[PDB]
Amino acid sequence: YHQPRVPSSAIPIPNVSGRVPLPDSTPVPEDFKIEIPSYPYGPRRVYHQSNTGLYGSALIRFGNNVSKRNEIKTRRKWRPNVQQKRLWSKSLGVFVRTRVTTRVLRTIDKVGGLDEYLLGHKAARVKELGPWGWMLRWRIMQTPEIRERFAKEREALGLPPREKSLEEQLREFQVAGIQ
Amino acid sequence: ATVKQHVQLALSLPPRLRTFLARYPPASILPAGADPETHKTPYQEESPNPFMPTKHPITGKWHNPKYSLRRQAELVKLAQEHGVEELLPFTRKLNEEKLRKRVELGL
Amino acid sequence: GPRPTMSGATRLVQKRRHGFLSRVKTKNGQKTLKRRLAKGRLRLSA
Amino acid sequence: ASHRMRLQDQGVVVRLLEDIPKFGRKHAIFRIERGRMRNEWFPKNKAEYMTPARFQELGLTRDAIGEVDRSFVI
Amino acid sequence: EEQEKEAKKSAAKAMLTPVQEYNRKQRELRRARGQPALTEEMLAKIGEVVARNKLG
RNA sequence: UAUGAACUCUUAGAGAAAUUACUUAAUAAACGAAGUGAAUUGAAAUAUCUUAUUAACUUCAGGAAAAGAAAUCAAACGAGAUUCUAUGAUUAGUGUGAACGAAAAUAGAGCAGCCUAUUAAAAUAAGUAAAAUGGCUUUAAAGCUGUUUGAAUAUUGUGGG
RNA sequence: UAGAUGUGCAUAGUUAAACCGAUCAUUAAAAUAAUGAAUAGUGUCUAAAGUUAGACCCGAAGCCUGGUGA
Ligand SMILES: [K+]
Ligand SMILES: [K+]
Ligand SMILES: [Mg+2]
Ligand SMILES: [Mg+2]
Ligand SMILES: [Mg+2]
Ligand SMILES: [Mg+2]
Ligand SMILES: [Mg+2]
Ligand SMILES: [Mg+2]
Ligand SMILES: [Mg+2]
Ligand SMILES: [Mg+2]
Ligand SMILES: [Mg+2]
Ligand SMILES: [Mg+2]
Ligand SMILES: [Mg+2]
Ligand SMILES: [Mg+2]
Ligand SMILES: [Mg+2]
Ligand SMILES: [Mg+2]
Numbered sequence: 001y002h003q004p005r006v007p008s009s010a011i012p013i014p015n016v017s018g019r020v021p022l023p024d025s026t027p028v029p030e031d032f033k034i035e036i037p038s039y040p041y042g043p044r045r046v047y048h049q050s051n052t053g054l055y056g057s058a059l060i061r062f063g064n065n066v067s068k069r070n071e072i073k074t075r076r077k078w079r080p081n082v083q084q085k086r087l088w089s090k091s092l093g094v095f096v097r098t099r100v101t102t103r104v105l106r107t108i109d110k111v112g113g114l115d116e117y118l119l120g121h122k123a124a125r126v127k128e129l130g131p132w133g134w135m136l137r138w139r140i141m142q143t144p145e146i147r148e149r150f151a152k153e154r155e156a157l158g159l160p161p162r163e164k165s166l167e168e169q170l171r172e173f174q175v176a177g178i179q
Numbered sequence: 180a181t182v183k184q185h186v187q188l189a190l191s192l193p194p195r196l197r198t199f200l201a202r203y204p205p206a207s208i209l210p211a212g213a214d215p216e217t218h219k220t221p222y223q224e225e226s227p228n229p230f231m232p233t234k235h236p237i238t239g240k241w242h243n244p245k246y247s248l249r250r251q252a253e254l255v256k257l258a259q260e261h262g263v264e265e266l267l268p269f270t271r272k273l274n275e276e277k278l279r280k281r282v283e284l285g286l
Numbered sequence: 287g288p289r290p291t292m293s294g295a296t297r298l299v300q301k302r303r304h305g306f307l308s309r310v311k312t313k314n315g316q317k318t319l320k321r322r323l324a325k326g327r328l329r330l331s332a
Numbered sequence: 333a334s335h336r337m338r339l340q341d342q343g344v345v346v347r348l349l350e351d352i353p354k355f356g357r358k359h360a361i362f363r364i365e366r367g368r369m370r371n372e373w374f375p376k377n378k379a380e381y382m383t384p385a386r387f388q389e390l391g392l393t394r395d396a397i398g399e400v401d402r403s404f405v406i
Numbered sequence: 407e408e409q410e411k412e413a414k415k416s417a418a419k420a421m422l423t424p425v426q427e428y429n430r431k432q433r434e435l436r437r438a439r440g441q442p443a444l445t446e447e448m449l450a451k452i453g454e455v456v457a458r459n460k461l462g
Numbered sequence: 463u464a465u466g467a468a469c470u471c472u473u474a475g476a477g478a479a480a481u482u483a484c485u486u487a488a489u490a491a492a493c494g495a496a497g498u499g500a501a502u503u504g505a506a507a508u509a510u511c512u513u514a515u516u517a518a519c520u521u522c523a524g525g526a527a528a529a530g531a532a533a534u535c536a537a538a539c540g541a542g543a544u545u546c547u548a549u550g551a552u553u554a555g556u557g558u559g560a561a562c563g564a565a566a567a568u569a570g571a572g573c574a575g576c577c578u579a580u581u582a583a584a585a586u587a588a589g590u591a592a593a594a595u596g597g598c599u600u601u602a603a604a605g606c607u608g609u610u611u612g613a614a615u616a617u618u619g620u621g622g623g
Numbered sequence: 624u625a626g627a628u629g630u631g632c633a634u635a636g637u638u639a640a641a642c643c644g645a646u647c648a649u650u651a652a653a654a655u656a657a658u659g660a661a662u663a664g665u666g667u668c669u670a671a672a673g674u675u676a677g678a679c680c681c682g683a684a685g686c687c688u689g690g691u692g693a
Contacts, residue, residue, distance in 0.1 A: 185453025262459025
């Protein structure tokens with residue numbers, strides 16, 4: 001999709017292909033790439049359309065067209081109610097464009113927003129996210145809002161406070177290019 | 180001299196039983212003046228009764244028992260074959276409780 | 287009846303249409319090789 | 333009348349944060365159309381979804397849901 | 407080529423939530439406790455129950 | 463029991479494989495799982511049905527894979543994960559018919575349990591269970607599913623069957 | 624050593640079926656009133672057979688699926 005530019009972040013919203021192409025305006029040392037951790041459950045072998053949107057657990061289903069008198073069976077399909085919406089992300093602060101089903105839209109309102117739908121750790125949710133939803137999950141993790149939220153939740157669980165960030169690495173390349 | 184063979188009887192039990200008794204020892208086998216509340220085994224501290232569900236304090240959700248009703252029946256059947264059924268904690272699969280609930284309440 | 291369909295036939299079309307590379311570089315051509323290889327053929331192509 | 337009717341959505345529970353006029357005062361809980369909250373209020377930080385966890389932190393119960401006040405004025 | 411493969415498959419450890427990191431840390435502390443051992447003082451008391459329920 | 467050598471292509475890139483040009487560039491089939499899914503045929507025609515969760519194709523994966531330690535079956539007694547073979551069974555049952563067709567249980571091959579899983583996983587699971595509707599499966603249940611909706615908190619009787 | 628274990632068939636028939644039972648079923652109550660139904664099985668071999676599988680042998684045009692060729 002054509003995603004907006006994050007207000008105060010050089011890292012753009014990833015491409016559905018998994019690539020994060022940076023503008024040539026950003027000086028970057030050659031042989032450098034932003035690789036997103038692979039999806040734990042791997043891509044979806046059928047209905048590749050769902051590998052680029054928030055489809056949840058909905059796929060294309062095949063069944064029969066049953067007549068009225070003789071009950072003759074004919075093959076048909078059942079497609080999910082896929083729509084293209086602009087969802088607000090509090091962390092990023094922009095309207096993330098994506099294809100989402102009407103059932104996943106209700107879940108977004110149920111959890112409290114797009115960010116709360118991507119940060120879920122339950123196995124059922126990571127499967128619903130898919131390759132695309134896993135990339136948005138990775139993008140919000142780099143934001144300072146989610147970073148300060150996880151750093152605060154580690155103090156309640158008795159975890160030590162938590163190397164270098166990816167947003168500062170790109171900042172270090174602009175000062176390095178001036179020297 | 181009969182104490183050297185008693186330990187040989189406890190050491191002859193199946194490993195599946197020795198393991199369970201090691202982490203969930205009842206107050207009967209503990210030392211004479213021992214207090215069950217203190218020196219609790221790390222497993223007992225997590226679950227006083229591994230056969231009953233426990234409500235996590237922080238999160239208001241019940242945790243399934245460490246031994247399912249199917250595995251509870253296998254320990255009672257394996258413990259009853261070696262005469263150590265008096266050591267297992269309370270279980271609805273106990274041959275006595277199963278029979279007590281019937282005589283008490285009936286059909 | 288049969289016709290002389292190989293009159294004026296060039297060996298450049300044989301390599302393009304039935305050659306080895308016309309098959310290893312296509313999905314359906316890999317089957318022909320694997321099929322002909324399972325049967326034990328020496329002449330996999332052309 | 334019938335024994336079964338078309339299933340409908342009554343809206344989403346939200347708590348106002350900016351004292352929206354014609355809808356309710358600040359910190360007012362009620363059900364609103366999912367479209368207005370999703371496209372207008374939430375992006376502008378005018379309201380917030382009332383998730384089950386939000387009810388516990390604020391100490392309120394599910395029985396505190398009000399109704400929209402079309403006659404409200406600042 | 408093997409270290410770049412194992413390190414790649416372990417690259418998702420930076421996307422873990424604080425709870426996922428907390429549970430994974432408890433296994434390291436739990437697995438270090440080991441298995442409780444049965445004192446021969448306790449084994450002697452267990453044999454008494456066995457002998458009493460087999461021969462009397 | 464060690465050991466020297468072991469060319470070219472399939473198999474860097476290109477191309478009319480065994481060439482070019484480079485370089486210490488390199489992995490068939492059968493079997494497995496999911497997805498998709500016929501027709502001949504039989505019913506003495508033929509539509510539901512049967513053929514058939516078949517053949518075939520596509521994807522992904524390993525030496526095997528899949529499955530697996532009960533939200534399982536039983537029936538007032540009890541059994542105790544999965545897998546394979548036989549009986550149960552031309553049975554219950556479904557279907558106008560033609561035909562299709564279980565499970566409990568038993569015998570044998572193996573036998574192993576667990577979350578501290580002998581390789582590193584859960585803070586015990588919510589858009590889920592479930593409902594209506596359109597289908598699959600099927601005995602109407604259970605199970606699978608598109609659409610629109612949408613719960614509860616443990617034997618001190620909460621949830622599924 | 625001892626105990627138990629391993630499909631099945633028959634030993635009782637009757638009715639739609641259960642209760643019932645050398646008796647049972649129908650007679651809207653029952654009752655010799657009548658009518659119908661009652662007495663060696665089981666295993667093995669040899670052989671001939673019914674059923675389902677290619678099913679005594681040879682023979683279509685055609686239908687579907689995956690591939691090949693301008
Ligand atoms: K007919
Ligand atoms: K029948
Ligand atoms: Mg698609
Ligand atoms: Mg011709
Ligand atoms: Mg010509
Ligand atoms: Mg509406
Ligand atoms: Mg070469
Ligand atoms: Mg090449
Ligand atoms: Mg069977
Ligand atoms: Mg549970
Ligand atoms: Mg459901
Ligand atoms: Mg029910
Ligand atoms: Mg059902
Ligand atoms: Mg259910
Ligand atoms: Mg009889
Ligand atoms: Mg021509």
